[PDB]
Design a protein around this motif. Sequence first.
Motif, PDB file in Angstrom:
ATOM      1  N   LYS A 144      35.693  43.872  37.949  1.00 33.89           N
ATOM      2  CA  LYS A 144      34.309  43.414  38.235  1.00 33.89           C
ATOM      3  C   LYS A 144      34.306  41.882  38.278  1.00 33.89           C
ATOM      4  CE  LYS A 144      32.939  47.737  37.553  1.00 33.89           C
ATOM      5  NZ  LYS A 144      34.226  48.228  37.009  1.00 33.89           N
ATOM      6  N   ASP A 145      35.055  41.224  37.379  1.00 41.16           N
ATOM      7  CA  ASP A 145      35.037  39.768  37.339  1.00 41.16           C
ATOM      8  C   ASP A 145      36.443  39.197  37.453  1.00 41.16           C
ATOM      9  OD1 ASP A 145      32.141  39.554  36.735  1.00 41.16           O
ATOM     10  OD2 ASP A 145      32.738  40.547  34.865  1.00 41.16           O
ATOM     11  N   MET A 146      37.436  40.002  37.120  1.00 35.38           N
ATOM     12  CA  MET A 146      38.771  39.513  36.846  1.00 35.38           C
ATOM     13  C   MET A 146      39.721  39.953  37.948  1.00 35.38           C
ATOM     14  SD  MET A 146      39.345  37.287  34.795  1.00 35.38           S
ATOM     15  CE  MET A 146      41.122  37.118  34.936  1.00 35.38           C
ATOM     16  N   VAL A 147      40.642  39.060  38.283  1.00 34.62           N
ATOM     17  CA  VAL A 147      41.792  39.395  39.103  1.00 34.62           C
ATOM     18  C   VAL A 147      43.046  39.280  38.256  1.00 34.62           C
ATOM     19  CG1 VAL A 147      40.694  38.766  41.242  1.00 34.62           C
ATOM     20  CG2 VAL A 147      41.918  37.068  39.998  1.00 34.62           C
ATOM     21  N   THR A 148      43.899  40.309  38.359  1.00 30.99           N
ATOM     22  CA  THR A 148      45.132  40.382  37.534  1.00 30.99           C
ATOM     23  C   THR A 148      46.367  40.593  38.413  1.00 30.99           C
ATOM     24  OG1 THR A 148      44.691  42.708  37.177  1.00 30.99           O
ATOM     25  CG2 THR A 148      43.999  41.223  35.418  1.00 30.99           C
ATOM     26  N   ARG A 149      47.409  39.796  38.209  1.00 33.07           N
ATOM     27  CA  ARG A 149      48.671  39.861  38.926  1.00 33.07           C
ATOM     28  C   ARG A 149      49.671  40.572  38.033  1.00 33.07           C
ATOM     29  NH1 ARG A 149      52.670  34.709  39.090  1.00 33.07           N
ATOM     30  NH2 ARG A 149      54.442  35.582  40.247  1.00 33.07           N
ATOM     31  N   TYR A 150      50.109  41.749  38.461  1.00 26.45           N
ATOM     32  CA  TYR A 150      51.056  42.540  37.692  1.00 26.45           C
ATOM     33  C   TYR A 150      52.402  42.498  38.398  1.00 26.45           C
ATOM     34  CZ  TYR A 150      53.402  46.408  35.411  1.00 26.45           C
ATOM     35  OH  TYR A 150      54.311  47.189  34.736  1.00 26.45           O
ATOM     36  N   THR A 151      53.344  41.767  37.814  1.00 31.36           N
ATOM     37  CA  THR A 151      54.668  41.566  38.397  1.00 31.36           C
ATOM     38  C   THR A 151      55.703  42.324  37.578  1.00 31.36           C
ATOM     39  OG1 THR A 151      54.076  39.399  39.303  1.00 31.36           O
ATOM     40  CG2 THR A 151      56.422  39.870  38.976  1.00 31.36           C
ATOM     41  N   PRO A 152      56.304  43.451  38.051  1.00 34.72           N
ATOM     42  CA  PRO A 152      57.380  44.118  37.294  1.00 34.72           C
ATOM     43  C   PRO A 152      58.587  43.212  36.996  1.00 34.72           C
ATOM     44  CG  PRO A 152      57.238  45.038  39.522  1.00 34.72           C
ATOM     45  CD  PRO A 152      55.982  44.237  39.262  1.00 34.72           C
ATOM     46  N   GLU A 153      59.417  43.596  36.022  1.00 40.01           N
ATOM     47  CA  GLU A 153      60.585  42.764  35.617  1.00 40.01           C
ATOM     48  C   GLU A 153      61.646  42.756  36.725  1.00 40.01           C
ATOM     49  OE1 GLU A 153      59.540  45.458  33.647  1.00 40.01           O
ATOM     50  OE2 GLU A 153      60.942  46.933  34.473  1.00 40.01           O
TER      51      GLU A 153
ATOM     52  N   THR C  35      38.201  36.777  43.136  1.00 38.39           N
ATOM     53  CA  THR C  35      37.802  38.188  43.389  1.00 38.39           C
ATOM     54  C   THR C  35      36.952  38.232  44.665  1.00 38.39           C
ATOM     55  OG1 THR C  35      37.406  38.060  41.016  1.00 38.39           O
ATOM     56  CG2 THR C  35      37.107  40.228  42.025  1.00 38.39           C
ATOM     57  N   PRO C  36      37.174  39.185  45.600  1.00 36.42           N
ATOM     58  CA  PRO C  36      36.431  39.203  46.864  1.00 36.42           C
ATOM     59  C   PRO C  36      34.935  39.369  46.573  1.00 36.42           C
ATOM     60  CG  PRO C  36      37.667  41.261  46.543  1.00 36.42           C
ATOM     61  CD  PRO C  36      38.155  40.267  45.511  1.00 36.42           C
ATOM     62  N   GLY C  37      34.576  40.272  45.656  1.00 37.11           N
ATOM     63  CA  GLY C  37      33.165  40.390  45.243  1.00 37.11           C
ATOM     64  C   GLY C  37      33.060  40.313  43.732  1.00 37.11           C
ATOM     65  N   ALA C  38      32.383  39.282  43.216  1.00 35.12           N
ATOM     66  CA  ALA C  38      32.217  39.125  41.754  1.00 35.12           C
ATOM     67  C   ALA C  38      30.997  38.250  41.459  1.00 35.12           C
ATOM     68  CB  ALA C  38      33.463  38.525  41.152  1.00 35.12           C
ATOM     69  N   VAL C  39      30.434  38.369  40.255  1.00 33.17           N
ATOM     70  CA  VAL C  39      29.312  37.470  39.854  1.00 33.17           C
ATOM     71  C   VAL C  39      29.780  36.698  38.615  1.00 33.17           C
ATOM     72  CG1 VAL C  39      28.272  39.586  38.891  1.00 33.17           C
ATOM     73  CG2 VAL C  39      26.969  37.441  38.859  1.00 33.17           C
ATOM     74  N   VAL C  40      29.684  35.365  38.645  1.00 37.78           N
ATOM     75  CA  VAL C  40      30.070  34.550  37.456  1.00 37.78           C
ATOM     76  C   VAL C  40      29.100  34.898  36.315  1.00 37.78           C
ATOM     77  CG1 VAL C  40      30.593  32.237  36.577  1.00 37.78           C
ATOM     78  CG2 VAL C  40      30.889  32.727  39.009  1.00 37.78           C
ATOM     79  N   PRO C  41      29.507  35.521  35.173  1.00 38.30           N
ATOM     80  CA  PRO C  41      28.529  35.890  34.145  1.00 38.30           C
ATOM     81  C   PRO C  41      27.722  34.677  33.710  1.00 38.30           C
ATOM     82  CG  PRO C  41      30.796  35.985  33.311  1.00 38.30           C
ATOM     83  CD  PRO C  41      30.874  35.914  34.799  1.00 38.30           C
ATOM     84  N   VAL C  42      26.442  34.917  33.418  1.00 36.37           N
ATOM     85  CA  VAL C  42      25.511  33.815  33.194  1.00 36.37           C
ATOM     86  C   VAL C  42      25.930  32.987  31.984  1.00 36.37           C
ATOM     87  CG1 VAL C  42      23.872  35.102  31.751  1.00 36.37           C
ATOM     88  CG2 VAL C  42      23.060  33.229  33.223  1.00 36.37           C
ATOM     89  N   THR C  43      26.537  33.628  30.982  1.00 41.96           N
ATOM     90  CA  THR C  43      26.986  32.897  29.800  1.00 41.96           C
ATOM     91  C   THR C  43      28.050  31.869  30.162  1.00 41.96           C
ATOM     92  OG1 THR C  43      26.499  34.840  28.441  1.00 41.96           O
ATOM     93  CG2 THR C  43      27.892  33.126  27.475  1.00 41.96           C
ATOM     94  N   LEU C  44      29.106  32.297  30.860  1.00 40.51           N
ATOM     95  CA  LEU C  44      30.115  31.340  31.300  1.00 40.51           C
ATOM     96  C   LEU C  44      29.607  30.496  32.461  1.00 40.51           C
ATOM     97  CD1 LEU C  44      32.991  30.399  30.693  1.00 40.51           C
ATOM     98  CD2 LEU C  44      33.766  31.878  32.534  1.00 40.51           C
ATOM     99  N   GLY C  45      28.616  30.995  33.201  1.00 42.35           N
ATOM    100  CA  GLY C  45      28.024  30.194  34.259  1.00 42.35           C
ATOM    101  C   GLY C  45      27.346  28.945  33.731  1.00 42.35           C
TER     102      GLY C  45
END
Lengths: 158, 48, 52
Positions: A144-153, C35-45
């Motif tokens: 929802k907010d985060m992007v994560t890069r998962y790189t195997p060994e 992130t292609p679609g995301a909202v910056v949470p207001v607290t960290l915003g």
Amino acid sequence: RMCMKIENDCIFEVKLDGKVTGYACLVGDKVMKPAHVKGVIDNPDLAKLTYKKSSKYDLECAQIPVHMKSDASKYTHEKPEGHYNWHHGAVQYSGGRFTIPTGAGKPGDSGRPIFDNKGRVVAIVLGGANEGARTALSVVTWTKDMVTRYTPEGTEEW
Amino acid sequence: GASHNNQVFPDMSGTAMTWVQRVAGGLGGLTLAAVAVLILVTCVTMRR
Amino acid sequence: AAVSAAGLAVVLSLLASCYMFATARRKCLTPYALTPGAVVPVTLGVLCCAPR
Ligand SMILES: CCCCCCCC/C=C\CCCCCCCC(=O)O[C@H](COC(=O)CCCCCCC/C=C/CCCCCCCC)COP(=O)(O)OCC[N+](C)(C)C
Ligand SMILES: CC(C)CCC[C@@H](C)[C@H]1CC[C@H]2[C@@H]3CC=C4C[C@@H](O)CC[C@]4(C)[C@H]3CC[C@]12C
Ligand SMILES: CC(C)CCC[C@@H](C)[C@H]1CC[C@H]2[C@@H]3CC=C4C[C@@H](O)CC[C@]4(C)[C@H]3CC[C@]12C
Ligand SMILES: CCCCCCCCCCCCCCCCCC(=O)O
Ligand SMILES: CCCCCCCCCCCCCCCCCC(=O)O
Ligand SMILES: CCCCCCCCCCCCCCCC(=O)O
Ligand SMILES: CCCCCCCCCCCCCCCC(=O)O
Ligand SMILES: CCCCCCCCCCCCCCCC(=O)O
């Protein structure tokens, strides 16, 4: 075979010295270009933009012009346990890892997205680690907010 | 002639040294606050 | 010479503090934009003055 036509519009190639080095994708409203890829996007409209820099995450993105959104592929965050689609074959998802049969990837060919059943983008391939008959995939993954890069060994960048 | 040793360095607690020390303390507090914020942020990043 | 050196030291201290603070802000706000679609949470915003 719908995923292929969806790839057609989304993928704009990166060519350095006339060799396609990698690809970029119009996902959401950005261009998913991997940072390791050195070169020039073919369409000028995406070349004249300012691109952000990210090394730990290995990505480069810039706001696509108002004419490129209608041309962009769709995104999603459903990573249910099962089977997805790819340009060169299929991606097996289990235990948070994308895996491909060995022999489906040569160097280059980075930047191609991963699609679910009905066309929504789920991943952007960066590389992979050879793992028996079932090679894994370094990849950019998102929530929802985060992007994560998962790189195997022992991963090579292809 | 002068009957002193010709010492012109003000006291560590003199008014000039008091203002200098105040400015240094404020700047050091700001710098240490920034250091603490960055170290907490980096700790959280390696935590995730 | 003493006043010039003190002013240079103060300017260096301020620049270092501001730059490393901005490094902290960037490091904290980069993944959300990626992130292609995301909202910056207001607290960290509000905590870090999100661009939007
Ligand atoms: C951020 C603040 C600090 C950065 C700048 C510091 C200045 C250093 C750079 C410049 C070089 C030239 C000046 C030399 C200073 C050393 C003093 C000395 O020479 O000290 C001497 C011995 O040392 C000490 O006891 C202490 C050693 C160093 C002192 C530490 C603090 C000194 C003051 C600095 C703080 C404020 C600076 C300016 C603030 C202005 C506000 C914007 C003082 O003995 P005396 O006077 O009897 O010797 C002279 C002999 N007579 C009088 C016969 C000619
Ligand atoms: C620019 C930063 C890094 C350092 C600032 C130093 C400058 C702005 C300051 C340092 C000490 C100052 C000098 C200290 C006292 C005097 C004597 C006065 O009768 C005329 C001005 C004069 C000569 C000042 C001019 C400006 C000055 C040279
Ligand atoms: C932080 C860096 C840029 C150094 C700043 C130094 C400032 C705060 C100080 C250093 C020396 C000071 C000057 C020293 C002497 C004089 C002459 C006096 O008749 C009027 C004030 C005046 C003109 C001062 C104004 C303020 C001054 C310029
Ligand atoms: C000298 C006094 C020591 C007390 C220190 C108090 C700590 C400051 C309170 C809030 C710190 C949070 C900053 C870290 C950024 C949070 C967001 C994140 O980690 O992603
Ligand atoms: C879109 C670009 C965003 C950058 C500008 C907006 C956010 C910047 C923060 C707002 C100004 C803060 C004041 C200067 C920073 C203070 C640092 C310090 O002196 O300790
Ligand atoms: C020297 C005065 C007291 C020292 C404390 C100063 C408080 C500064 C404010 C803290 C910075 C804001 C917190 C979020 C920073 C970030 O991670 O981007
Ligand atoms: C003066 C600059 C740093 C040099 C001194 C290093 C000694 C302190 C150790 C550094 C912190 C290491 C602890 C792990 C946390 C981290 O990886 O950031
Ligand atoms: C000398 C009197 C006080 C002057 C110093 C005030 C300190 C200002 C605070 C600077 C912290 C950084 C501000 C940005 C934080 C944010 O909103 O994200």
